[PDB]
Design a protein around this ligand. Sequence first.
Ligand SMILES: CC(=O)Oc1ccccc1
Ligand SMILES: CC(=O)Oc1ccccc1
Ligand SMILES: CC(=O)Oc1ccccc1
Ligand SMILES: CC(=O)Oc1ccccc1
Ligand SMILES: CC(=O)Oc1ccccc1
Lengths: 275, 275, 275, 275, 275, 275
Amino acid sequence: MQVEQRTLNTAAHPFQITAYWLDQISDFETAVDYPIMIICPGGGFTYHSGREEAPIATRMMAAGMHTVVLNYQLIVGDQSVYPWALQQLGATIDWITTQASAHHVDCQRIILAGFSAGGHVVATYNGVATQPELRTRYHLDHYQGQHAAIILGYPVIDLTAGFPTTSAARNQITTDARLWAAQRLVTPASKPAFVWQTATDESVPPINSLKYVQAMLQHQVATAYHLFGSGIHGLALANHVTQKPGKDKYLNDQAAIWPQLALRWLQEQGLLAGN
Amino acid sequence: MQVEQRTLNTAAHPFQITAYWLDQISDFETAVDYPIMIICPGGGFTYHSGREEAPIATRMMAAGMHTVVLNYQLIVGDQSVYPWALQQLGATIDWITTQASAHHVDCQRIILAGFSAGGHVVATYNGVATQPELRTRYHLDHYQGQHAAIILGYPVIDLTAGFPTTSAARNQITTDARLWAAQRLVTPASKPAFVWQTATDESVPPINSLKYVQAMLQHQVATAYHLFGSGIHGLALANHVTQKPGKDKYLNDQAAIWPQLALRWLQEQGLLAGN
Amino acid sequence: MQVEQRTLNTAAHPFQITAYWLDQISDFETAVDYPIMIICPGGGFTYHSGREEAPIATRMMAAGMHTVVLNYQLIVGDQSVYPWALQQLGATIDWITTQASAHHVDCQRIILAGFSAGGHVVATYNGVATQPELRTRYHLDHYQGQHAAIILGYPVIDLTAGFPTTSAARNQITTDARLWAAQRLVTPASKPAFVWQTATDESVPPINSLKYVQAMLQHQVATAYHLFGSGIHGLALANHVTQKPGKDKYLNDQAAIWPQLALRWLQEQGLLAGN
Amino acid sequence: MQVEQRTLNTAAHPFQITAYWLDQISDFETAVDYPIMIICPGGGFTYHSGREEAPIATRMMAAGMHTVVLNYQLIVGDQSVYPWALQQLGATIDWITTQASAHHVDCQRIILAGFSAGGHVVATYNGVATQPELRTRYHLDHYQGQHAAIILGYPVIDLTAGFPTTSAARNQITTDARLWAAQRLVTPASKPAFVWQTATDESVPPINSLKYVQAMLQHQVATAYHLFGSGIHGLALANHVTQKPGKDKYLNDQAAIWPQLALRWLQEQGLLAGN
Amino acid sequence: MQVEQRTLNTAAHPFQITAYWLDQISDFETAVDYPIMIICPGGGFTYHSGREEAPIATRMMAAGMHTVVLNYQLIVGDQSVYPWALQQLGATIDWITTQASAHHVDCQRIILAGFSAGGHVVATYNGVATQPELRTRYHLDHYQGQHAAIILGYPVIDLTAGFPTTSAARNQITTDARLWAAQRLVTPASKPAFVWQTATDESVPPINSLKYVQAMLQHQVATAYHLFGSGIHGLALANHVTQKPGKDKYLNDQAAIWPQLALRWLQEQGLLAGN
Amino acid sequence: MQVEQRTLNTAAHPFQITAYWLDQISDFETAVDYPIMIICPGGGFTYHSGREEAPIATRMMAAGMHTVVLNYQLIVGDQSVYPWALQQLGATIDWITTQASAHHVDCQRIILAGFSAGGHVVATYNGVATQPELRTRYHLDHYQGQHAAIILGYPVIDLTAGFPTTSAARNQITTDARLWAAQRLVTPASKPAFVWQTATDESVPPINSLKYVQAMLQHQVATAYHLFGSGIHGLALANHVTQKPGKDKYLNDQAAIWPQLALRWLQEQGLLAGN
Ligand SMILES: CC(=O)Oc1ccccc1
Ligand SMILES: CC(=O)Oc1ccccc1
Ligand SMILES: CC(=O)Oc1ccccc1
Ligand SMILES: CC(=O)Oc1ccccc1
Ligand SMILES: CC(=O)Oc1ccccc1
């Protein structure tokens, strides 16, 4: 295993990635290209949550994929998230295509994963980067490669749907209301989505995931949805690894099955080797 | 996540380790010390099998533990595995104690994992390093730190018990017949052992694991044993990650549950945080 | 000790830092969080002077603090220093807060040090970043963390006060005269300043430092000031370490005591462990 | 030998370089400063061709020079190449001057190599960076150092001269027609050029290189030109190293002597040590 | 291109290597396995000469091969060169086999290159490692992989043949006289040898190379030999790259063609891709 | 500043070093060779004390020298300290000579610093490595380079002189009593020594330094000695940097002047640039 931390400069706003590369198993007689997952964590658009970075990447690497963590555009200075964060995703996928041979990446198996705020970028991107009208508007044109599916964990999907609370916090995120709500952007072009959330999510009401999934079916898009009964927002892995020390509310054994559900779903979709 | 690859020189035969350090999560308020697992892979004493190195490390690391892979003494040159391989383990545990504060290692939770030939070293060590008589005999004296438990996967336990096939290959492994068989070395002071193997193991006969568990019980040491019904030798993870490309015999979905079994077992022993 | 060199992208103009991290002492039974000093060297806004980077960092590291060298915005292309350089400082402090647990940084003990042209950035920042009005104007809002004190060595404080020599050179630094003079930016909210300069400073008139201290006191901010009697501009450490080879005019034994004065002043401020 | 990969932030558009530094020979009793070659590969302004990076840098390194590969501005997002790419070259040369002491670089011996699209940037730069009229217009002022010579392999010199085909592709490269054609930008100020191309270049008509040389003589700049008889576009080293697997058309043994011709030409100019 | 510097511990005397790995070209739609050359420099058995390390490795790398520099056993402390250096060579080849898949090494194309004292190790190894009686005697048994050919530049072949001078120097190198002379070790199992030397070699008489070739033929091993008319010992590349500053005697344009001769010879042996 | 961690294999027992290299100052017109200090920490021959590694290295680095920390042979396995540790010092000095050109090391200014147990190795080495009789006997022959002076801080000088307490502990350190006591090894060939200790040293009675200093004047070798009136063993820097958290007994302001005293002592010896 190798770890690469790096600035990519091929977008208007340069950004940092952290790639975790799988190494070839040395006593294999032949080579294998592995899938790769790009993770956009949460942190409410003002920071990148560590709980949703390495611990999630490591769990997915365990199942045999490369992973990359994208530090997408935050609110800092008077900066807005969009349209920049969308462009950084496109550049990250592009950059991956250039690294394929060196790292044995299966470019037909590029997965994006978003959590909370992170989910908005990915949900939007699955929307935006699947319609050339919105591609051009947002300058995702001229980037190589594309993603095969998305995974969304308790995603922000609609900025008027409870998060963020105050109007003045919507606006920081963006004064472009044409993507306050990722549900309205779904077309039959959108790539297959695995979605999960808790029903008891106070900070990001489940209608977000419902609305995306609802809209995912209404345009015939292969989608799976798990709304677990209990659990607070931001469970991450919902187990001791991502548990804030001494805070039981981060433990939820029912939600903790999601990575297994996710991986099995990726296999079904032909996007991960089956055993 | 950092990757450290390094020679340790505090043994008669210097040796390489590869450490994979967990990084602290930044959204945490307080620091956490994590367990560490040292892995001795298989390879029939002539090599170190990559199938049982990083893939296994990553899976254990996904559960929230540091891991280190130890290139124990092989048959190379007119060299024998023992007693050097034992000293290298002690040196590795020692080295961990000196890295504990920089990496947040919980030294009361140092776990050893052995696979196949690698299991002999760990099994022997579990015996030798808990008996001052054999400690001193084999030069493990003056090393800091101790391991809390072992994990053995399809472990070579007795060199007269099938592997190796010829008498000339077992000699190469060692002239010292006082540890051809680790099942004879087991005494009360030994640390708890989680053991698994398949029953249809041609290469390394199940009597090996049976004999060792027999002796852990006939000696009152907390233990656990899983002998799956089917499967060839060297399953590793028994899934697509460790599957030699196109070889179905490396898939066994029943055996594939062993890491979960092992993690839950560690949690029960209070050697890994629980859920 | 670890050396991290790195681009930070969380500002309008991305920029390089070079971080020098203290490692934990391994025979300490418990962990210690250390203070951190951010250094902005001189170079007359057209370069970053090496004499005021590592040699100064190492002397400060020897007293038990992390250090980071910041390559603030220079005059290059047709770029001005301001307001960008101010933002880069805010982002660096912010970045530090995110690295605190991994490196054991005491974020309550963040010190900024500026030299010559570098002092302007720091002196201005100390004023700007303690006033929401000037904060917001210059886009320092939304960044985490704050500095506890500043250190200024022969600082450029007023752009009309002799440096730079020509009209055409002032302007290249900035077409914003509301920052030509950091002495006018001084208000009571400011963090405490240790200031030193030589009286015979031909290149940057002592009126600069004198004006700043004059305003630190008139606004009741804790300040200490050493105006040494002899010596040219840019003494740095004023000894053989930073002495341009064969040039005695860089040696000044009286000025050479400043790091000691500064460290004791920091201890007095409760911003460094006392011995 | 050392390999440095890194972002430089001293341009409006930050960018990656990959520097390959020569190490001092240890049994030399005195040090030696080595020339350095900056390489801008081709890729038709939409990517950076690996065929024209490392394999070319390694060949030039074998003759005793440092090399740096410059990832100049491409067409990505709605971005055009110019004027940004010209600034990135200036910042790279500038950065080199700042590394000269640590790496023993002879700043009197900075050479630029451009291939295909990369050649346009180098050819244009050679024009722009020698005339302060076009210097100022394109924002190259305040950057230290200067190049002593260029090398152009099958360079794009004129955008209306066959490449790019469509008009829509012209424009993506630039809506500044003023430098669609580096031929008409040559003055006596220009640095000496070694130029080569094949006569049968379908993709980028030979008239391109012909025009630049024609212009290089008509304003009398020391120059040398090799238009080989056979060979497709993008030969690179024109041997097995840069040969696309199983594609004979990338082999051309007459063109393959170009690195020798170039090196001898550099020795002639006093830009490389001689034999 | 990546540079790996590392201790290998798989011999009685552990030892450092410096590997220079070629990176795959990202434009190639398929992958390519490259040959690899192990280089044993000279230094008269008391040091490793830098003139014969990187400079030579870089020239060979430019031709499209991986290279590794082996720091073989010297006369240091009280040690003799043999039989350890032979084991270190075997362990290095072995290590390469384990790196083959991660770096795309063609294990049927492993070439050994020795210079001066380094040449003795290579020449002897070519003999020893091609004879199981002498294989075993010297403990090269149990190591994987083997080399396809050797290259010898002004090699030490016989220790009584003028190098080393005094009796007391030969003995330091080794008291085992059975391989004072690599000519006698030659048998038809020996891999093919490209050999070169100058006839005016005062330091190491030409009869050395003469005798080895003289025996490669009389044992029907494919071999080529170039004895240049002029030139001192230790020409290395015989050009400005390996020339001691201000020392013309290191220049020799006739001998300087040797790397081209060797590469063509390798192509002829099907050991390097042809043009 | 660069940090190099590394195994050296040119001794019977390979060993780790950690080198801290000063970087050249970029705004110097000329280059400068700096002195280098090799540090052997204490730890009572069973471990290397972190209190006496980096913190001391950093403080010496601040004065403008390279530093290297040597992990000399410990009591581990059934291994003794001697004669191995002496060889390791020799190889380290030797290795430095091979790195001089690359790092600008002034090989005429190599200084050894030992603390407590580490002092014994340095003190003995000072004795052994200056007399060819003991040189040959202990196999320091054939290593290049030599040291100019030693620094000893509360050194163990005689193993009967209190430390270690029991006869069982001394013997572990070594059976060879011909260097239980470095005071008896002092002859006038020895390089100059700066020596310090506290009078109240319980664990290692002042007798040791006194006995060494006494013995050092009697062979007319330039020396300096400081015996502070208070303070326990192992003060290191005797300040807050090396203070065990909450343990005042590690603070001693009088002894804390020793680095300054030592540096000024090196200046008069002409082994460090003077200011
Ligand atoms: C225990 C050891 O080999 O020494 C060190 C010291 C600092 C960091 C890593 C290793
Ligand atoms: C820029 C940032 O905060 O991302 C990280 C996170 C952990 C380690 C290094 C960088
Ligand atoms: C054009 C280029 O060099 O792209 C990269 C970037 C990082 C690593 C390898 C290749
Ligand atoms: C010139 C500058 O300050 O950037 C650096 C810093 C350290 C090393 C290399 C480049
Ligand atoms: C002396 C040695 O082990 O080899 C080298 C040489 C140059 C740089 C690094 C290692």
